[PDB]
Amino acid sequence: STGSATTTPIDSLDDAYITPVQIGTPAQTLNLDFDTGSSDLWVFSSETTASEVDGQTIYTPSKSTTAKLLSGATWSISYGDGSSSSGDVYTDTVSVGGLTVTGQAVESAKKVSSSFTEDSTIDGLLGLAFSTLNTVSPTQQKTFFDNAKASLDSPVFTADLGYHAPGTYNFGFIDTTAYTGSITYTAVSTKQGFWEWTSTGYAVGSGTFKSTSIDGIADTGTTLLYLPATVVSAYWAQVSGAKSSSSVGGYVFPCSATLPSFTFGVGSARIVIPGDYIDFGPISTGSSSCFGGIQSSAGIGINIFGDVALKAAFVVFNGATTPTLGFASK
C-alpha cells in the first residue's frame, strides 16, 4: 500500500504545516502537524478542557464506532518550545492520504498548554520519530508509520515541504518526479529516538564550503534551523546590522536586508537554502527588525534541521531495518 497527502503552511511565514488526517468511523478529519521529532499522535478532543479549546477541530471518540478506550493508558508530553499536553488513549482507525491503519493509538488531550490553545490551525500532532520516544504509559504505543510499515510497498515516507506553498507527505514510495538529480543517503543513529544524522559542513552565500561534522536531527515539527553558535555567527556576520538580541530571543536583522543563502552538506552533496527562506518577518507587527530563520542551538543540546532546511530538499525517511535519511535538491 501507499499514501499521499498534501501538507499546507498554517500561515504566511511557514511557521508549521498541517496535513489532513481521517480518524474513526465515520471519518473525523483533523489537521495535524506531522512531526519527525516526536512519536505521539495526539488530538484536541471532546475530552479537552473547554477553556483550552479555541477554534480547533476536535475528535469525539463516542461518535466513532471503531474507537475503543485503551484502558489505563495515559500520556504526557513536553516540547522544545515549552509547550505541553496530556490525556488518555483510544485506539481507532487512522488514514493519511488513502493509507489506513487500524488499531492506531490516538492520544486524546484532556489538557493542552496555552500555545496550543492559541493556535486555532493545529488540531494535534502526528509523530514520526521512533516509537521508543512514545509517551503512553504503562504500555508504550507505536507511531502511525511503525504500524503502517509492514503493509507499505517500501518502508519509507518522504517529506516535500513547500516554501510559502503546499507540499506533500508520501508513505510507501519515492516519487521520482518530485526532485532533481539524485538522492544522497546518509547514516542515521536512532540512539536518542530521532532521525539523527551528521551533515558534512556548510557554506554561507557564495563562500567556500567548510568541511565539518554537524550532528543533528531532521525535524519537520521545528520551524527553524538550529546550528552551533560558530556556524550561526558566521552566517549572520554576512548581513549588515544583524545581531543577537537576548530580549527578542535570537538573531534579528534589518527587514531591508537581502539575505544570503545557506548551504549544508549531505555526504558529498549540497543542499542550498535560499536567503528568502531564512526571513521570518517582523519581530512584532510593524517593526523593521526581522527574525532570523537560522538560530543557535546552544543550550538546546542538539542541532535541529527544522523546516527552514528541510523545505529546501526532498527528504526520504527510510525506515528499513537499518534506517537512513536521503536528501535531494528539488
Side-chain angles (χ1 to χ4, degrees), residues 1-62 64-67 69-109 112-141 143-148 150-190 192-242 244-330:
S1 61
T2 63
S4 181
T6 297
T7 191
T8 301
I10 64 168
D11 61 25
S12 65
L13 299 178
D14 296 350
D15 279 317
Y17 298 79
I18 49 171
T19 307
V21 178
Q22 282 72 47
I23 310 175
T25 308
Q28 299 178 39
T29 299
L30 275 64
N31 296 329
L32 306 188
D33 186 347
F34 282 25
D35 181 14
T36 63
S38 69
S39 306
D40 287 50
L41 193 176
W42 74 261
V43 297
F44 278 79
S45 75
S46 57
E47 302 181 325
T48 312
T49 297
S51 59
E52 298 184 344
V53 183
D54 191 4
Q56 296 81 11
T57 295
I58 64 167
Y59 170 57
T60 304
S62 66
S64 175
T65 60
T66 40
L69 179 70
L70 188 62
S71 184
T74 60
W75 63 279
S76 182
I77 191 164
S78 302
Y79 297 103
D81 63 347
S83 68
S84 63
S85 52
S86 64
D88 53 24
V89 187
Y90 293 82
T91 56
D92 209 340
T93 303
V94 173
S95 298
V96 177
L99 170 66
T100 302
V101 170
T102 58
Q104 174 65 44
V106 177
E107 303 173 35
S108 168
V112 303
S113 64
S114 57
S115 290
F116 284 114
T117 300
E118 286 158 3
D119 178 12
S120 65
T121 70
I122 291 178
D123 301 324
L125 267 64
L126 190 149
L128 291 167
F130 293 88
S131 293
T132 53
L133 295 184
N134 177 265
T135 78
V136 177
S137 177
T139 306
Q140 191 173 59
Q141 300 294 305
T143 70
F144 175 81
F145 178 55
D146 254 17
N147 282 323
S151 296
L152 295 177
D153 289 357
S154 180
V156 306
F157 67 91
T158 65
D160 180 9
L161 303 178
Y163 167 67
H164 297 173
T168 306
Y169 281 102
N170 290 328
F171 293 83
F173 74 104
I174 286 154
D175 180 357
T176 61
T177 71
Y179 57 89
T180 63
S182 298
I183 307 179
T184 296
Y185 287 89
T186 195
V188 164
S189 174
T190 65
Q192 296 172 5
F194 300 123
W195 293 91
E196 182 173 5
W197 63 291
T198 302
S199 170
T200 49
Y202 71 97
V204 176
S206 60
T208 61
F209 186 82
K210 174 74 169 181
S211 291
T212 187
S213 293
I214 307 300
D215 297 340
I217 67 168
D219 184 4
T220 58
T222 291
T223 310
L224 307 184
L225 173 55
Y226 293 90
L227 290 174
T230 48
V231 180
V232 175
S233 183
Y235 178 81
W236 289 109
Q238 298 305 309
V239 181
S240 188
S244 185
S245 166
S246 60
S247 65
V248 179
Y251 280 91
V252 299
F253 66 93
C255 294
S256 59
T258 302
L259 296 180
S261 65
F262 184 87
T263 300
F264 65 93
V266 183
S268 56
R270 307 287 178 254
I271 299 297
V272 180
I273 305 172
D276 294 342
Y277 289 28
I278 298 161
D279 174 21
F280 280 74
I283 60 170
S284 292
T285 304
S287 177
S288 73
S289 183
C290 275
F291 198 71
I294 295 179
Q295 297 293 346
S296 178
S297 64
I300 294 179
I302 195 161
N303 301 305
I304 307 176
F305 293 87
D307 297 335
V308 164
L310 303 181
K311 77 177 77 169
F314 177 88
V315 187
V316 181
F317 293 80
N318 168 25
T321 305
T322 300
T324 66
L325 273 171
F327 290 85
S329 298
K330 65 185 183 191

Short mmCIF file of all heavy atoms in Angstrom, two decimals, residues 101-153, unseen atoms left out:
data_model
loop_
_atom_site.label_atom_id
_atom_site.label_comp_id
_atom_site.label_asym_id
_atom_site.label_seq_id
_atom_site.Cartn_x
_atom_site.Cartn_y
_atom_site.Cartn_z
N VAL A 101 -4.49 2.66 8.81
CA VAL A 101 -4.02 1.82 9.91
C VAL A 101 -5.19 1.57 10.84
O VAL A 101 -5.82 2.53 11.30
CB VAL A 101 -2.86 2.50 10.68
CG1 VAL A 101 -2.53 1.75 11.98
CG2 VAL A 101 -1.62 2.60 9.80
N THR A 102 -5.48 0.32 11.14
CA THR A 102 -6.46 0.00 12.17
C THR A 102 -5.74 -0.19 13.50
O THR A 102 -4.57 -0.59 13.54
CB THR A 102 -7.27 -1.25 11.80
OG1 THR A 102 -6.39 -2.36 11.61
CG2 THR A 102 -8.07 -1.02 10.52
N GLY A 103 -6.42 0.13 14.59
CA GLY A 103 -5.86 -0.03 15.92
C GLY A 103 -4.75 0.95 16.27
O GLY A 103 -3.95 0.68 17.16
N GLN A 104 -4.70 2.09 15.59
CA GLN A 104 -3.74 3.13 15.92
C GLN A 104 -4.06 3.77 17.27
O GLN A 104 -5.20 4.12 17.55
CB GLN A 104 -3.76 4.21 14.84
CG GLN A 104 -2.89 5.43 15.14
CD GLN A 104 -1.42 5.08 15.19
OE1 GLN A 104 -0.92 4.34 14.33
NE2 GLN A 104 -0.71 5.60 16.20
N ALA A 105 -3.03 3.95 18.10
CA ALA A 105 -3.20 4.72 19.32
C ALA A 105 -3.42 6.20 19.00
O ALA A 105 -2.56 6.86 18.41
CB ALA A 105 -2.00 4.56 20.22
N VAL A 106 -4.59 6.70 19.39
CA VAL A 106 -4.98 8.09 19.24
C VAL A 106 -5.06 8.66 20.64
O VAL A 106 -5.92 8.28 21.44
CB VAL A 106 -6.32 8.24 18.49
CG1 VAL A 106 -6.72 9.72 18.41
CG2 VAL A 106 -6.21 7.63 17.09
N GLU A 107 -4.13 9.56 20.94
CA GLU A 107 -4.00 10.10 22.27
C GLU A 107 -4.88 11.34 22.38
O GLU A 107 -4.67 12.32 21.69
CB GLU A 107 -2.52 10.40 22.53
CG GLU A 107 -1.67 9.15 22.36
CD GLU A 107 -0.18 9.42 22.44
OE1 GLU A 107 0.21 10.32 23.22
OE2 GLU A 107 0.59 8.73 21.74
N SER A 108 -5.88 11.24 23.23
CA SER A 108 -6.87 12.29 23.40
C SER A 108 -6.44 13.26 24.48
O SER A 108 -6.22 12.85 25.62
CB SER A 108 -8.19 11.63 23.78
OG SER A 108 -9.12 12.61 24.20
N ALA A 109 -6.34 14.53 24.13
CA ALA A 109 -5.91 15.54 25.11
C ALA A 109 -7.02 15.90 26.10
O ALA A 109 -8.15 16.25 25.71
CB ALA A 109 -5.41 16.77 24.39
N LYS A 110 -6.70 15.81 27.38
CA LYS A 110 -7.52 16.39 28.42
C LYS A 110 -7.04 17.80 28.74
O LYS A 110 -7.83 18.66 29.13
CB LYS A 110 -7.48 15.53 29.68
CG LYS A 110 -8.06 14.14 29.48
CD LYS A 110 -7.94 13.28 30.71
N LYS A 111 -5.74 18.03 28.57
CA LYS A 111 -5.10 19.32 28.84
C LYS A 111 -4.10 19.65 27.74
O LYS A 111 -3.36 18.79 27.29
CB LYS A 111 -4.35 19.27 30.17
CG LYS A 111 -5.21 18.92 31.37
N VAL A 112 -4.09 20.91 27.34
CA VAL A 112 -3.07 21.44 26.43
C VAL A 112 -2.58 22.78 26.98
O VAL A 112 -3.33 23.50 27.64
CB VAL A 112 -3.61 21.63 24.99
CG1 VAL A 112 -4.15 20.32 24.44
CG2 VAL A 112 -4.67 22.72 24.91
N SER A 113 -1.32 23.12 26.70
CA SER A 113 -0.77 24.39 27.14
C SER A 113 -1.25 25.55 26.26
O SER A 113 -1.83 25.35 25.18
CB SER A 113 0.76 24.34 27.22
OG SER A 113 1.35 24.14 25.95
N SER A 114 -0.98 26.76 26.72
CA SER A 114 -1.56 27.96 26.11
C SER A 114 -1.21 28.11 24.63
O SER A 114 -2.04 28.56 23.83
CB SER A 114 -1.14 29.21 26.89
OG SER A 114 0.27 29.33 26.97
N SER A 115 0.01 27.76 24.25
CA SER A 115 0.41 27.95 22.86
C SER A 115 -0.40 27.07 21.92
O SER A 115 -0.65 27.47 20.80
CB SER A 115 1.90 27.72 22.68
OG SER A 115 2.62 28.78 23.30
N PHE A 116 -0.83 25.90 22.39
CA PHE A 116 -1.66 25.05 21.56
C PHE A 116 -3.05 25.66 21.44
O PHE A 116 -3.61 25.76 20.35
CB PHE A 116 -1.71 23.62 22.11
CG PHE A 116 -0.46 22.82 21.84
CD1 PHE A 116 0.37 22.42 22.87
CD2 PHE A 116 -0.12 22.48 20.54
CE1 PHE A 116 1.51 21.69 22.61
CE2 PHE A 116 1.03 21.76 20.28
CZ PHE A 116 1.84 21.36 21.31
N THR A 117 -3.61 26.10 22.56
CA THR A 117 -4.93 26.73 22.56
C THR A 117 -4.94 27.93 21.61
O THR A 117 -5.89 28.12 20.85
CB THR A 117 -5.29 27.21 23.97
OG1 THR A 117 -5.32 26.09 24.86
CG2 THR A 117 -6.66 27.93 23.99
N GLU A 118 -3.87 28.71 21.66
CA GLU A 118 -3.79 29.97 20.93
C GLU A 118 -3.65 29.78 19.42
O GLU A 118 -3.87 30.72 18.65
CB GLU A 118 -2.64 30.80 21.48
CG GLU A 118 -2.96 31.41 22.83
CD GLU A 118 -1.74 31.79 23.65
OE1 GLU A 118 -0.60 31.65 23.15
OE2 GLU A 118 -1.93 32.21 24.81
N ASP A 119 -3.28 28.57 19.00
CA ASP A 119 -3.12 28.28 17.58
C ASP A 119 -4.31 27.47 17.06
O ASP A 119 -4.36 26.24 17.21
CB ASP A 119 -1.82 27.52 17.32
CG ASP A 119 -1.63 27.17 15.88
OD1 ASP A 119 -2.38 27.69 15.02
OD2 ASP A 119 -0.73 26.36 15.59
N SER A 120 -5.28 28.16 16.47
CA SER A 120 -6.52 27.52 16.05
C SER A 120 -6.34 26.58 14.87
O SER A 120 -7.25 25.81 14.58
CB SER A 120 -7.56 28.58 15.67
OG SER A 120 -7.15 29.32 14.55
N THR A 121 -5.20 26.66 14.19
CA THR A 121 -4.99 25.93 12.94
C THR A 121 -4.47 24.49 13.12
O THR A 121 -4.53 23.71 12.18
CB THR A 121 -3.99 26.66 11.99
OG1 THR A 121 -2.66 26.58 12.52
CG2 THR A 121 -4.37 28.10 11.74
N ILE A 122 -3.94 24.17 14.30
CA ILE A 122 -3.35 22.86 14.57
C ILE A 122 -4.26 22.08 15.51
O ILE A 122 -4.47 22.49 16.67
CB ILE A 122 -1.90 23.00 15.09
CG1 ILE A 122 -1.01 23.52 13.95
CG2 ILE A 122 -1.39 21.67 15.61
CD1 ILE A 122 0.44 23.76 14.31
N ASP A 123 -4.80 20.96 15.02
CA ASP A 123 -5.75 20.15 15.78
C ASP A 123 -5.06 19.02 16.55
O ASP A 123 -5.72 18.25 17.24
CB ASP A 123 -6.79 19.52 14.83
CG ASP A 123 -7.57 20.55 14.04
OD1 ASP A 123 -7.86 21.62 14.60
OD2 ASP A 123 -7.95 20.25 12.88
N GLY A 124 -3.73 18.92 16.43
CA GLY A 124 -2.96 17.90 17.10
C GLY A 124 -1.69 17.62 16.33
O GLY A 124 -1.38 18.32 15.37
N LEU A 125 -0.95 16.61 16.78
CA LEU A 125 0.33 16.23 16.20
C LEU A 125 0.28 14.77 15.78
O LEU A 125 -0.40 13.94 16.39
CB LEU A 125 1.48 16.41 17.22
CG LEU A 125 2.21 17.76 17.16
CD1 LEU A 125 1.27 18.89 17.54
CD2 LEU A 125 3.42 17.75 18.08
N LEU A 126 1.03 14.47 14.73
CA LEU A 126 1.26 13.09 14.34
C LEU A 126 2.76 12.82 14.32
O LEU A 126 3.49 13.31 13.45
CB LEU A 126 0.58 12.79 12.99
CG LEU A 126 0.55 11.31 12.57
CD1 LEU A 126 -0.68 10.99 11.74
CD2 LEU A 126 1.80 10.90 11.80
N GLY A 127 3.22 12.11 15.33
CA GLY A 127 4.65 11.86 15.49
C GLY A 127 5.19 10.84 14.51
O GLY A 127 4.58 9.81 14.28
N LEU A 128 6.38 11.13 14.00
CA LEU A 128 7.03 10.29 13.01
C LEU A 128 8.50 10.02 13.37
O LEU A 128 9.26 9.52 12.53
CB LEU A 128 6.91 10.92 11.62
CG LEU A 128 5.50 10.94 11.02
CD1 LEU A 128 5.44 11.86 9.80
CD2 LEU A 128 5.07 9.52 10.66
N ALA A 129 8.90 10.32 14.61
CA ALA A 129 10.18 9.83 15.13
C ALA A 129 10.02 8.35 15.53
O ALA A 129 9.02 7.70 15.19
CB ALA A 129 10.65 10.69 16.31
N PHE A 130 11.01 7.79 16.21
CA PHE A 130 10.99 6.36 16.52
C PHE A 130 10.08 6.10 17.71
O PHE A 130 9.97 6.93 18.61
CB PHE A 130 12.42 5.84 16.68
CG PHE A 130 13.18 5.87 15.38
CD1 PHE A 130 13.87 7.00 14.99
CD2 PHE A 130 13.10 4.80 14.51
CE1 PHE A 130 14.52 7.03 13.77
CE2 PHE A 130 13.75 4.83 13.30
CZ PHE A 130 14.45 5.95 12.92
N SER A 131 9.44 4.93 17.71
CA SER A 131 8.40 4.65 18.69
C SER A 131 8.95 4.56 20.11
O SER A 131 8.19 4.64 21.06
CB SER A 131 7.65 3.38 18.32
OG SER A 131 6.90 3.59 17.14
N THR A 132 10.26 4.40 20.25
CA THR A 132 10.90 4.43 21.57
C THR A 132 10.68 5.75 22.32
O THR A 132 10.85 5.78 23.54
CB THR A 132 12.39 4.18 21.44
OG1 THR A 132 12.93 5.11 20.49
CG2 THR A 132 12.67 2.74 20.97
N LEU A 133 10.30 6.82 21.63
CA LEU A 133 10.01 8.10 22.29
C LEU A 133 8.54 8.26 22.66
O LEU A 133 8.18 9.24 23.29
CB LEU A 133 10.43 9.29 21.43
CG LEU A 133 11.92 9.43 21.14
CD1 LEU A 133 12.16 10.71 20.35
CD2 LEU A 133 12.75 9.45 22.41
N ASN A 134 7.68 7.32 22.27
CA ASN A 134 6.26 7.48 22.55
C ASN A 134 6.02 7.53 24.06
O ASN A 134 6.61 6.75 24.82
CB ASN A 134 5.46 6.33 21.93
CG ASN A 134 3.99 6.42 22.26
OD1 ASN A 134 3.53 5.79 23.22
ND2 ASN A 134 3.25 7.22 21.49
N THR A 135 5.15 8.44 24.51
CA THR A 135 4.99 8.66 25.94
C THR A 135 3.87 7.87 26.64
O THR A 135 3.67 8.03 27.84
CB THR A 135 4.78 10.17 26.31
OG1 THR A 135 3.43 10.57 26.04
CG2 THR A 135 5.76 11.06 25.57
N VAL A 136 3.12 7.05 25.92
CA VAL A 136 1.99 6.35 26.53
C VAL A 136 2.51 5.40 27.61
O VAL A 136 3.47 4.65 27.40
CB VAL A 136 1.13 5.61 25.49
CG1 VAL A 136 0.00 4.83 26.15
CG2 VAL A 136 0.57 6.58 24.44
N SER A 137 1.83 5.43 28.75
CA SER A 137 2.14 4.61 29.91
C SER A 137 0.85 3.92 30.37
O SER A 137 -0.23 4.51 30.31
CB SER A 137 2.69 5.51 31.02
OG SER A 137 2.94 4.78 32.21
N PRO A 138 0.94 2.67 30.85
CA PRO A 138 2.15 1.87 31.09
C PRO A 138 2.64 1.04 29.90
O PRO A 138 3.66 0.36 30.01
CB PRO A 138 1.70 0.93 32.21
CG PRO A 138 0.25 0.70 31.93
CD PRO A 138 -0.26 2.02 31.41
N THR A 139 1.92 1.10 28.78
CA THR A 139 2.24 0.32 27.60
C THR A 139 2.52 1.29 26.46
O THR A 139 1.62 1.96 25.96
CB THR A 139 1.07 -0.60 27.22
OG1 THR A 139 0.71 -1.39 28.36
CG2 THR A 139 1.43 -1.52 26.07
N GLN A 140 3.79 1.39 26.07
CA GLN A 140 4.22 2.30 25.02
C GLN A 140 3.56 1.91 23.71
O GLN A 140 3.38 0.73 23.42
CB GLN A 140 5.75 2.25 24.88
CG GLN A 140 6.35 3.33 24.01
CD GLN A 140 7.86 3.33 24.05
OE1 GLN A 140 8.49 2.32 23.72
NE2 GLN A 140 8.44 4.44 24.49
N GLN A 141 3.22 2.91 22.90
CA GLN A 141 2.49 2.69 21.65
C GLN A 141 3.34 3.04 20.44
O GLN A 141 4.29 3.82 20.53
CB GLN A 141 1.21 3.53 21.65
CG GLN A 141 0.28 3.18 22.79
CD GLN A 141 -0.29 1.77 22.69
OE1 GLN A 141 -0.88 1.39 21.68
NE2 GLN A 141 -0.13 1.00 23.75
N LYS A 142 2.97 2.46 19.31
CA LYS A 142 3.69 2.67 18.06
C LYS A 142 3.17 3.86 17.26
O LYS A 142 1.98 4.17 17.27
CB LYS A 142 3.58 1.44 17.17
CG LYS A 142 4.19 0.20 17.80
CD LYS A 142 4.24 -0.96 16.82
N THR A 143 4.07 4.50 16.52
CA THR A 143 3.67 5.56 15.61
C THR A 143 2.86 5.02 14.43
O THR A 143 2.86 3.82 14.12
CB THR A 143 4.88 6.31 15.02
OG1 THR A 143 5.56 5.44 14.13
CG2 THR A 143 5.84 6.80 16.10
N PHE A 144 2.19 5.94 13.75
CA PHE A 144 1.44 5.63 12.55
C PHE A 144 2.33 4.95 11.51
O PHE A 144 1.95 3.96 10.89
CB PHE A 144 0.83 6.92 11.99
CG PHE A 144 0.13 6.73 10.68
CD1 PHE A 144 -1.16 6.24 10.63
CD2 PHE A 144 0.75 7.07 9.50
CE1 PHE A 144 -1.81 6.05 9.42
CE2 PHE A 144 0.10 6.90 8.28
CZ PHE A 144 -1.18 6.40 8.26
N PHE A 145 3.54 5.48 11.30
CA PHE A 145 4.47 4.89 10.35
C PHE A 145 4.89 3.49 10.76
O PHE A 145 4.92 2.57 9.95
CB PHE A 145 5.68 5.80 10.19
CG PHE A 145 6.74 5.27 9.26
CD1 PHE A 145 6.45 4.91 7.95
CD2 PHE A 145 8.04 5.17 9.70
CE1 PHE A 145 7.45 4.43 7.10
CE2 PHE A 145 9.03 4.71 8.86
CZ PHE A 145 8.74 4.34 7.57
N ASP A 146 5.22 3.30 12.03
CA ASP A 146 5.60 1.99 12.51
C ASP A 146 4.49 0.97 12.30
O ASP A 146 4.75 -0.15 11.85
CB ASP A 146 5.98 2.05 13.98
CG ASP A 146 7.46 1.95 14.19
OD1 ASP A 146 8.21 2.16 13.21
OD2 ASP A 146 7.86 1.66 15.34
N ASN A 147 3.26 1.35 12.60
CA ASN A 147 2.12 0.48 12.39
C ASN A 147 1.89 0.18 10.90
O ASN A 147 1.50 -0.93 10.55
CB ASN A 147 0.85 1.08 13.00
CG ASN A 147 0.79 0.89 14.49
OD1 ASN A 147 1.19 -0.15 15.03
ND2 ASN A 147 0.26 1.89 15.18
N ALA A 148 2.14 1.15 10.03
CA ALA A 148 1.85 1.01 8.60
C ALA A 148 2.94 0.27 7.85
O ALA A 148 2.70 -0.28 6.78
CB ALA A 148 1.65 2.38 7.97
N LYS A 149 4.14 0.25 8.42
CA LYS A 149 5.36 -0.09 7.70
C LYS A 149 5.27 -1.42 6.95
O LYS A 149 5.62 -1.51 5.77
CB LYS A 149 6.54 -0.12 8.68
CG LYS A 149 7.92 -0.13 8.04
CD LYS A 149 8.99 0.35 9.02
N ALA A 150 4.81 -2.46 7.64
CA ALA A 150 4.80 -3.80 7.08
C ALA A 150 3.89 -3.89 5.85
O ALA A 150 4.07 -4.75 4.99
CB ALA A 150 4.36 -4.80 8.13
N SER A 151 2.90 -3.00 5.78
CA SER A 151 1.94 -3.00 4.68
C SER A 151 2.38 -2.16 3.50
O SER A 151 1.86 -2.30 2.40
CB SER A 151 0.58 -2.53 5.17
OG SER A 151 0.06 -3.43 6.13
N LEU A 152 3.36 -1.29 3.71
CA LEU A 152 3.80 -0.37 2.68
C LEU A 152 4.58 -1.06 1.57
O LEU A 152 5.28 -2.05 1.80
CB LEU A 152 4.69 0.71 3.28
CG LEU A 152 4.01 1.64 4.29
CD1 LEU A 152 5.02 2.61 4.88
CD2 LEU A 152 2.85 2.37 3.62
N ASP A 153 4.49 -0.52 0.36
CA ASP A 153 5.24 -1.07 -0.77
C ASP A 153 6.75 -1.04 -0.46
O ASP A 153 7.48 -1.98 -0.81
CB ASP A 153 4.94 -0.29 -2.05
CG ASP A 153 3.53 -0.54 -2.58
OD1 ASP A 153 2.78 -1.37 -2.00
OD2 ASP A 153 3.17 0.09 -3.59
#
